[PDB]
Design an enzyme around this catalytic site. Structure first.
Site, PDB file in Angstrom:
ATOM      1  N   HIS A  70     -12.716  -3.803   4.750  1.00  0.00           N
ATOM      2  CA  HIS A  70     -11.272  -3.921   4.742  1.00  0.00           C
ATOM      3  C   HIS A  70     -10.633  -3.298   5.975  1.00  0.00           C
ATOM      4  O   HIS A  70     -10.132  -4.006   6.844  1.00  0.00           O
ATOM      5  CB  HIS A  70     -10.704  -3.297   3.461  1.00  0.00           C
ATOM      6  CG  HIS A  70      -9.230  -3.486   3.300  1.00  0.00           C
ATOM      7  ND1 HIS A  70      -8.603  -3.413   2.077  1.00  0.00           N
ATOM      8  CD2 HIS A  70      -8.254  -3.726   4.210  1.00  0.00           C
ATOM      9  CE1 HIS A  70      -7.305  -3.599   2.240  1.00  0.00           C
ATOM     10  NE2 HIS A  70      -7.069  -3.791   3.525  1.00  0.00           N
ATOM     11  N   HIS A  94      -2.382   2.269   8.397  1.00  0.00           N
ATOM     12  CA  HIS A  94      -3.464   1.427   7.934  1.00  0.00           C
ATOM     13  C   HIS A  94      -3.526   0.164   8.787  1.00  0.00           C
ATOM     14  O   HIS A  94      -2.513  -0.502   9.025  1.00  0.00           O
ATOM     15  CB  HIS A  94      -3.274   1.049   6.461  1.00  0.00           C
ATOM     16  CG  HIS A  94      -4.158  -0.073   6.017  1.00  0.00           C
ATOM     17  ND1 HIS A  94      -5.529  -0.029   6.131  1.00  0.00           N
ATOM     18  CD2 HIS A  94      -3.865  -1.279   5.478  1.00  0.00           C
ATOM     19  CE1 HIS A  94      -6.046  -1.160   5.684  1.00  0.00           C
ATOM     20  NE2 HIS A  94      -5.057  -1.937   5.282  1.00  0.00           N
ATOM     21  N   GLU A 124     -15.972  12.131  22.937  1.00  0.00           N
ATOM     22  CA  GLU A 124     -14.632  12.522  22.559  1.00  0.00           C
ATOM     23  C   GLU A 124     -14.356  12.644  21.070  1.00  0.00           C
ATOM     24  O   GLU A 124     -13.519  13.446  20.669  1.00  0.00           O
ATOM     25  CB  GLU A 124     -13.657  11.514  23.154  1.00  0.00           C
ATOM     26  CG  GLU A 124     -13.733  10.162  22.467  1.00  0.00           C
ATOM     27  CD  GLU A 124     -13.127   9.055  23.289  1.00  0.00           C
ATOM     28  OE1 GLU A 124     -13.694   8.745  24.360  1.00  0.00           O
ATOM     29  OE2 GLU A 124     -12.095   8.486  22.865  1.00  0.00           O
ATOM     30  N   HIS A 142      -6.570  -3.052  10.222  1.00  0.00           N
ATOM     31  CA  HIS A 142      -7.882  -3.641  10.131  1.00  0.00           C
ATOM     32  C   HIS A 142      -8.595  -3.561  11.461  1.00  0.00           C
ATOM     33  O   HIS A 142      -8.721  -4.552  12.171  1.00  0.00           O
ATOM     34  CB  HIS A 142      -7.732  -5.083   9.663  1.00  0.00           C
ATOM     35  CG  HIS A 142      -6.993  -5.213   8.362  1.00  0.00           C
ATOM     36  ND1 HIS A 142      -6.447  -6.403   7.925  1.00  0.00           N
ATOM     37  CD2 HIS A 142      -6.762  -4.312   7.376  1.00  0.00           C
ATOM     38  CE1 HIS A 142      -5.919  -6.230   6.726  1.00  0.00           C
ATOM     39  NE2 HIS A 142      -6.098  -4.971   6.369  1.00  0.00           N
ATOM     40  N   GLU A 187       0.839  -1.193   0.000  1.00  0.00           N
ATOM     41  CA  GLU A 187       0.000   0.000   0.000  1.00  0.00           C
ATOM     42  C   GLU A 187       0.875   1.244   0.000  1.00  0.00           C
ATOM     43  O   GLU A 187       0.421   2.327   0.363  1.00  0.00           O
ATOM     44  CB  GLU A 187      -0.939   0.036   1.214  1.00  0.00           C
ATOM     45  CG  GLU A 187      -1.889  -1.164   1.349  1.00  0.00           C
ATOM     46  CD  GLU A 187      -2.931  -1.292   0.235  1.00  0.00           C
ATOM     47  OE1 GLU A 187      -3.688  -2.286   0.262  1.00  0.00           O
ATOM     48  OE2 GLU A 187      -3.006  -0.425  -0.659  1.00  0.00           O
TER      49      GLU A 187
HETATM   50 ZN   LIG Z   1      -5.203  -3.888   4.467  1.00  0.00          ZN
END
Ligand SMILES: [Zn+2]
Ligand SMILES: [Zn+2]
Ligand SMILES: [Zn+2]
Ligand SMILES: [Zn+2]
Ligand SMILES: [Zn+2]
Ligand SMILES: [Zn+2]
Ligand SMILES: [Zn+2]
Lengths: 273, 274, 274, 274, 273, 274, 274
Positions: free
Chosen positions: A211, A140, A170, A142, A116
């Site tokens: 994802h 990134h 918050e 999950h 990525e």
């Molecule tokens: Zn991923």
């Protein structure tokens, strides 16, 4: 001297390691990249590889020219970073004309940066412009509940943002700019890297349906906390929805009242709801 | 002299905040904790105090807490970082002779200041002091996950909420017979929520902030932590139960009353009435 | 020579079994793990071996595994204790020249034996060696909480289950494009279940045992662990989703195909029809 | 001789209570654990005991315990603290010659006492000794989160509850074939519950206390712990399943019976009727 | 969590590593021990060995009861500490009655603490009493020049101390208590551990003729700098003596003047010279 | 805005001090360095300044340096630690409108203050400013090993010492024709040594402190460092030469004069006279 | 499989040669290093080997080393570049079945060959294997600066030199109690010097080559390096001492004996007479 003790390598070990424990990164899931300054890696020029491997960049990114980053490796397990940093992390420096980068350190055993990366670098450029160089982290992972919610909530920036603000007082202050939502997209492509970046312009938090999530911040801890907050709200929401939905919640007026007390300007479309 | 970070109260603060992070009750900078100390506690460590203590005006006079020292969590500080760097996320403060403000004697390094819920804390401390004749010394705020969830499904009402929580775990009635108070949602970090919380602290040692978190008072760190952990455990059970469609049976009123008698404790009436 | 407990494989076994425990997939003596090694791996530790290696006849001959060494979890041993005492819960065994049995070269102390399932394992190792031209070297069984739960809720059909798991996390299709095999419930420990599982291993690297657990194969400890962890992660997402009333939207049949293509991987056909 | 803290049993007590803590089964002072030892175990540390061991008259005599030493958790003690200070939360006690009382030989410092439940424990130890010909040596009580939740949703009837738990995880039938006893809710601490629990211990090694927790007996710490962990794991699966809309399929009656036969264990029959 | 990143393990890596580079520790030469607090190693109880090896202490040291230390291993090379901490360092905790200690972490491959442990522990006790618990570090290394000087200077506390003060203005203030000198002694014995400790009572710096130096301080860096300062003076002296000796130097009066300006009381016997 | 630690001057300070440590010229807290900046340099980083800058009375008025900012090494700070933690060992200070004192705008964290040779530095800066009409901006003090050694064997006399150093390396005459000044030993960190050093700075850009170290002035960090490094290199050669029994031959006066002419530089007369 | 450059032996070779360079013992192409490995060591990297290993006939047969693999430094290669490109300056060679030569399995790229001294090395490896029952596995030659210097100053007699080196650092006697052998100067690279050195290796693990360097043998890279480093450290001390006029006092003949006893090691007799 041993770069593995530097602030940034230790920082990368802590972020990935915590993400593991939070259960947000199974297998090779998730990736993290941090923009450094020559000054950070200057003390270690002799800790680098003397035969810098070069890798053409998916596309010209002149704005990140001569810029070094420490990154997670492709196919690497967050859970292993702490035990073998060099093998799961790598310090890369983009050439003078954003055409590619040289692997200065780590990413041992012919390993390479995360798949990525395009998405990361593109988001970095946009976050640099949007935050006048402030933000330095792209993360990134999950996030379990954030993921779940994308199968039940309308995948719309405004409504999703609104649900997340309601899920924890918050939230409105941590991410007033709300969170962007992209339609599902085939991963690791430049098509998806641009969409994410396009969103990083207006939000510091982006969701990838079915994802995961993408976050930007000035430091490792600020980015991590950004995601952790969104994910905490999501975890609350999942429970609430499992119990049949909200009986009461934070009102629009109240959210606005909250935005004022903290000198922050809430995403308009989200407040309209 | 032993550095102040090895003092019982600093280690105590590291333990509470760290356990809280592990429990998943304090993401980002969520949650805060304050503990009232005595002069004798920090007296041995004068040598660790800053040499130009910072002074900070207090929201409102609190004469009841004059010359009273507290160790507190910092503003925008992450519970998760307290163990690594105590001094940077914790601070020992002392309220001046007329409860008008305080000096940061130790910690809260790098321009950091006490938590933004301070007003609420000090206000609640004063009441808990009057209500427990000095016994209570801790005020703890954290985002207990299930307790938070329940505030979106249960009627935000002291009696009802208290009742459900007692039913959610047999010992709840004995750990908190005074029940738990519930405030309407309120913009946080203000005095408004500080006052309200304090008003409730007069009647309960446990207070909930809808869609936000919980507030707890107790004599010690562990007791106060256990207080919240018990309410949050009950909440965790309830969440599961409600997710499975609700209670098929539960602890009866007669039973709660029987429970209260055996442990020589007097259960909040409104709660038992239900 | 560096004691064998620091070898990369003993340390690997501790990490896998321990993580599995921290995850809640191996209560009591639940689960087991076996890894096929090569002489070059244990050769260096001839010094740590048992002077008189106990030998144990293999019920049925495993000649194809003749002379092959494996490090395995013991019978009745608790994954949670592996780290506490590796030699006491792990053992390195070596199959004899004609696969008539094996010698316990290291560990498995105090009269302990390999998992009562070494047979199912060895049986599967064979089919997997065949299926991957010697690549797969690990067989792992654990009680993945959510995967187990889903077997009480989903149709126990390789295709349907496989499609759900792919939808539950984008990565799933690429990590296990051959899908996961599902057997009907079966008495554990019987040759019947060893044979059925192996039958499925010829086709899938992931097999589910309804109301029991999962079985995984991979080239390395981390690969096999990550395999299961991914399926279990998708399962965890699914469980939440189903608890909230089901999917409103998901990864389209089409999109999964677009995904398989993008990673030049060919997806189990049936899971894409239905 | 080595300090008693590094004893196999003291370390065992720390690991059990600590794991229990980490599992979320013992908030505040919830839960307690007792392990029957042999003199041979404590003998080596005769020099670690208190020169004037405090004696404590036992409610009612128990000659079957006479002279037997136990290591036990303290009253009001937090399982979470055993880790930091064993001696302050654990104690080794020895029952006199006629089981009229005991002496606190080691630990239970700062004037702490055993759990205000030794009698429920001691009573159950007796039944379990007779029911297992001296094999069982542990009585454990903890607030297993899911087991607790289920008691608000399932019929609190030994047979049906036992049946749900067997279906919730294949190995359950084998791990606790005698099923689990369910008592009606009762005021904890009283002797009525001590009695009731003990009567149930004659038939079952696992007993549930509605809206409270579970009680377990076993030969070793790890076994007892694994006993509870297995029941609780099944409960955790069940809770998810019920949250997703109940079972589609499950382990059949014939299958359970088949499972039992294969492991030479005789399943509690009422649990197979219904 | 990974104790190898803790402040003290990192500290031990830095001290040993710098000592290596200074060329003060060839082969297994030198050793270092640091007194910790339960609080320092509390965060890592699960990073320890669950089967703590025990080792009877050469002699009763009740004052260090229940006390944990991180130590260098016997036969270990300072140069290797940074690359494999666990294998060259170990965290030990002395039993409740100073009879021995348990190896809580590290010192892997059946390795054990340094052979100068008796000397270290004894010196620690004396430095604890003399500094009211301040000093926490005991460091031994083969400072090249300090060693050389012991073959040319009269091995006498006063004259040696006086030469070292003259060798660098800074010295009188860093170690006004001067440096103690023992007669040569067979190493790693309790006989020599007591002699060293006996000296630690009056000095924070002790020399072992034809062998090396022993230093005590409150922190790793303060101890290291203590030795580095003495060794720097020694290096200057060696050059000076090689050029035929001192033409001029810092006077007695001047040293006294120096002692006053810094509010420090110089060892009397050294000022007499 | 880029954090101030990435500014050219902060990195410059890290580089100089770190190189100095490597050269073995700064053991313990030995040595110090100060660099005069402009408002434009630190103007972009106002946002990194402390919010309650500390103020410190100055030893004596230095109007010539009014409103002048400097980045300086801290007191009791180790050159070796500057790279790891700049802010803790370096500080940016600004002299107030009437040269009476300064504010610590950035760094010198944790109650730290500027070097104890500050008086000497500022005094020397003022002269070097007047002597180089603002060109010079750096004052550097370090314990150059050989230079120090030489002060115990050479006649502490400007001319002689200067002469030997010129002979010790051909370029010395061109790098420092003004020769090097030598002060009598003096109690350090006082104004006494500050004044004396400054008096010498009027005539030389290099000053030696017998049995202590050297002081250097230059326009930039590198130039100033190179100045000292050259003198220290010459000293290193001389030490070797003297250890081998002294010079057999060397650069002649005629030659030094020939050298001075070619590089259009005017050599300190007293030095050439010898 | 993990590339071979990360193997513990390739990394070991980089560390040794590199440290040697940083120490100044290997200018240009000075020095060489060889380490005897076992199949179990390189067996795992059959994948990184040359598909067609170059073979080179050994001038004289080394059958006793038949089938033995060694990793070696190349001819004309600079120790300083080892780290820059391991494969280009290092090579793994394997002696054939009858010691008629060896195949270059890995590294030694661009037509590079082992050190022109593989013969002297192999010759010494033999005598050392004999002398240590297979323990020694390393032969190291480097130009230890001070050891070299001392050979122009001390009597080149094994006993006298050995005694000086023992006196120069307390540890020396225990690290090398058999003393160090000294050969008369000899043309380098000649069979004469290979034979002389080996002759000495039968007795000492350390050999000096006047006006050239040192030769060391040991079981591991770190042991052999530390061996030389210790002798060279003592030499460095001695050089300083002699430069200051000689020893005023030293380790007494007696004391060395007391030292040998304390470490139950037997000191070379002649070095203790004289
Ligand atoms: Zn991923
Ligand atoms: Zn809050
Ligand atoms: Zn199983
Ligand atoms: Zn209970
Ligand atoms: Zn030594
Ligand atoms: Zn100085
Ligand atoms: Zn040579």
């Amino acid at each position: 001297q041993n770069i593995t003790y530097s602030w940034f390598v230790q920082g990368m070990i802590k972020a990935t390691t915590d993400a593991w424990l939070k259960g947000w990164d199974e297998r090779n899931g998730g990736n993290l990249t941090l923009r450094l300054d020559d000054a950070d890696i200057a003390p270690y020029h002799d800790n680098f590889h003397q035969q810098p491997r070069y890798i053409p960049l998916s596309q010209p990114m002149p704005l990140l020219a001569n810029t070094p980053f420490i990154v997670t490796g492709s196919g690497k397990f967050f859970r292993n970073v702490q035990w073998d940093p060099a093998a799961n992390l790598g310090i890369v420096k983009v050439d003078s004309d954003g055409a590619g980068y040289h692997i200065l350190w780590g990413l041992t055993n012919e390993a390479v940066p995360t798949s990525e990366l395009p998405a990361h670098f593109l988001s970095h450029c946009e976050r640099i412009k949007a935050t006048n160089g402030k933000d330095r982290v792209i993360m990134h992972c999950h996030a379990t509940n954030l993921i779940a919610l994308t199968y039940v909530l309308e995948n719309d920036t405004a409504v999703f943002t609104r649900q997340l603000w309601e899920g924890s007082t918050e939230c409105l202050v941590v991410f007033p700019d709300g969170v962007g939502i992209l339609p599902w997209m085939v991963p690791g492509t430049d098509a998806i890297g641009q969409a994410t970046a396009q969103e990083m312009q207006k939000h510091s938090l982006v969701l990838w349906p079915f994802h995961g999530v993408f976050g930007s911040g000035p430091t490792l801890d600020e980015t991590f906390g950004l995601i952790d907050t969104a994910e905490k709200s999501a975890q609350v929401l999942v429970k609430v929805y499992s119990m049949g939905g909200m009986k009461q919640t934070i009102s629009r007026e109240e959210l606005i009242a909250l935005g004022k007390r903290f000198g922050v300007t809430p995403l308009a479309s989200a407040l309209a709801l």
